Amino acid sequence: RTPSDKPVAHVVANPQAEGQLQWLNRRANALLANGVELRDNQLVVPSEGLYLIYSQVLFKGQGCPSTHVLLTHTISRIAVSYQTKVNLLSAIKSPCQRETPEGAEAKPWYEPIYLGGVFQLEKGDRLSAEINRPDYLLFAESGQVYFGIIAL
Amino acid sequence: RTPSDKPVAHVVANPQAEGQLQWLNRRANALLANGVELRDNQLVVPSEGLYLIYSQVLFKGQGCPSTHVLLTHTISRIAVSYQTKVNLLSAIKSPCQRETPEGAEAKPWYEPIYLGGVFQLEKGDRLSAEINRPDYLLFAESGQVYFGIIAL
Amino acid sequence: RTPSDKPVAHVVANPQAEGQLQWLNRRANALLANGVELRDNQLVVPSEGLYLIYSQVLFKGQGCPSTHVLLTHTISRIAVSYQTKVNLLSAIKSPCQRETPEGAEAKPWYEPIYLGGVFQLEKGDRLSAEINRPDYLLFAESGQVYFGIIAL
């Protein structure tokens, strides 16, 4: 984990919570070292500094129901001074133009979303990566649904 | 604020700028730090070193118009020795592959392009980050379209 | 001398290669410095450290072929101890979900995929960026196909 004292975290999702996004620590490379902690599913940040922040979510859907599927992935900082979630990153993705699988019943889409960004954080700040539809989460984990920061 | 004696920058798209990607700092994490000067929509490099150049843009539209759009996102370098715009990171994105939609016309689409990599820049060379279709830019989320650097 | 004594890499994909992914520095914005070396198209890691490993591949295909194409992109660390491929990072996009374009010959789609994470390697490791379909890449690219590792 340490060498290089950097707050570092690279945390994997969890292929047990049937539809959810539980972050997991210890898998082959799931760095939670020196300073940063995961506490209620968030990366609590030590030090103070400019953290490079990243995550990827893989949404997986067999077919498309009537009405917009519209997926979303955000990373928000909950500040401990003037608190609350301040929005840092998120991206929107619509994986179906009207098709809506009757005919040749349900054949799959795959939608990766990846976020990356260098932000100034502060000692003790909490970090959230959330999706709006944990039903569409694929399972085959390590490099497929992940989250991380490193201090630069 | 400032940690480190690193040049950093994280500028954002002016949301009130009709049809042009125009950068901005002053905002949330809209850093211009140690010697990075933003100029004619571009970033002038202060120091010889590796920089991490990242950028994200978002594209929205509602319905898919005539047949073939192509959204492009390119970060370029107009360098202090090969003084010309060479090309650093680039992505093309096809929004809708048809619908054109007429039975029920404008259902919304959102495409996120993100870009980023380590390069060895020099003092004085500019970095540019344009998109070919500013009309397709989203300006309802700020944690969306930006451009930043940071020496490593 | 102040380039940097940091292991760094940024290889671009070679344009003269039919359906294969050949990585190449000795190119205009491709680094390889401080003992990293690209040996059998893979990256060998010089010292123990924490490394940001990132990767982008562009795919274009005109028309949407039958059944389901599925394009993948992953980075594997091929170790020094249990030295076979362990998947560090992975994404999967499917570009065609029906279209089959019959009385048409059809439109071209573009599909990019970005991969970036922080991982702890060990000395002598190898890292490989492998797509499942090289026959679908695109190279009037400058930054569209890349592989880079930087030591944090």
CA A29 to chain centre: 16
| Cα–Cα distance measured from residue A78 to residue A87, given in angstroms and rounded to the nearest whole number | 9
* Closest residue in chain B to residue A67, using alpha carbons only: B107
Is the CB of residue B46 less than 8 Å away from at least one CB of chain A? no
Q: Which of A89, C30, A42 is nearest to B114 (CA)?
A: A89
Per the rule left: phi > 0, alpha: psi between -120 and 50, beta: everything else, B67 is: left
Q: Contact C133/C33 with Cβ under 8 angstroms?
A: no
Nearest to A49 by CA among A125, A99, A122: A122
C143 interfaces chain B, CB cutoff of 8 Å: yes
**B14 closest CA partner among B3, B29, B24:** B24
Among residues A77, A73, A86, the alpha carbon closest in space to that of A127 is found at: A77
- Closest by Cβ to B4, choosing from A50, A97, A114: A50
Please report the residues numbered 65 through 124 in chain A whose beta carbons come closer than 8 angstroms to any beta carbon of chain B: 68, 70, 74, 86-94, 97-98, 113-120
| Minimum-distance CB partner of A108 among C49, C68, C152 | C68
How was this structure obtained? X-ray
Q: Which residues contact C82 (CB under 8 A, 6 or more apart)?
A: none
Query: Residues A130, A87: contact at Cβ < 8 Å?
Result: no
Contact partners of B by the rule of 3+ C-beta pairs under 8 A?
Answer: A, C
Return phi, psi of residue B52, to 5°: -105, 120
Q: Are C152 and A8 in contact (CB < 8 Å)? A: yes
Closest Cα to residue C66, out of A46, B128, A52, A104?
Answer: A104
Q: Which residues contact A40 (CB under 8 A, 6 or more apart)?
A: none
The DSSP code sequence of B70-136 is: -EEEEEEEE-SSS-SEEEEEEEEE---SS---TTS---EEEEEEEEEEEEEE-TT-EEEEEES-GGG
Q: Measure the CA–CA gap between A124 and C67, rounded to whole angstroms.
A: 50
The whole-angstrom separation of Cα B137 and Cα B118 is 26
- Dihedral sign for Cα atoms in the order A141, C83, C25, C8: positive
Interface test with C, best of B50, B51, B115, B121 (most C CBs within 10 A): B50
d(CA C147, CA B1): 32
How many residues can be counted in chain A? 152
Specify the number of domains making up chain A: 1
8 Å CB contact between B8 and A50: yes
Domain that holds residue C143: 1-152
CA dist C22 and C13 (Å) reads 6
For A31, nearest residue in chain C (alpha carbons) = C119
Provide the sign of the torsion angle of the four alpha carbons C28, C114, C119, A79, taken in this order.
Answer: positive
Cα-Cα-Cα-Cα dihedral sign, residues C34, C36, C37, C38: negative
Sequence-separated contacts (24+) of B25-31 with Cβ below 8 Å: B27/B142, B28/A86, B28/A88, B28/B142, B28/B143, B29/A88, B29/A117, B29/A118, B29/A119, B29/A120, B31/A120, B31/B148
Cβ contact, residue pair A104, C120, below 8 Å: no
**Can you tell me the distance from the alpha carbon of B97 to that of C108, in angstroms, rounded to the nearest whole number?**
8
Task: Find the CB nearest A91 among B98, B112, B146.
Answer: B112
Three-class DSSP category at A135: helix
Task: Assign residue C148 the CATH number of its domain.
Answer: 2.60.120.40
- Rounded distance between C-alpha atoms, residue B15 and residue B23, angstroms: 9
Rounded Cα distance, B87 and B96, in Å: 26
- Which chain C residues are closer than 8 Å to B97 by Cβ? 64, 95-96, 99, 107, 109
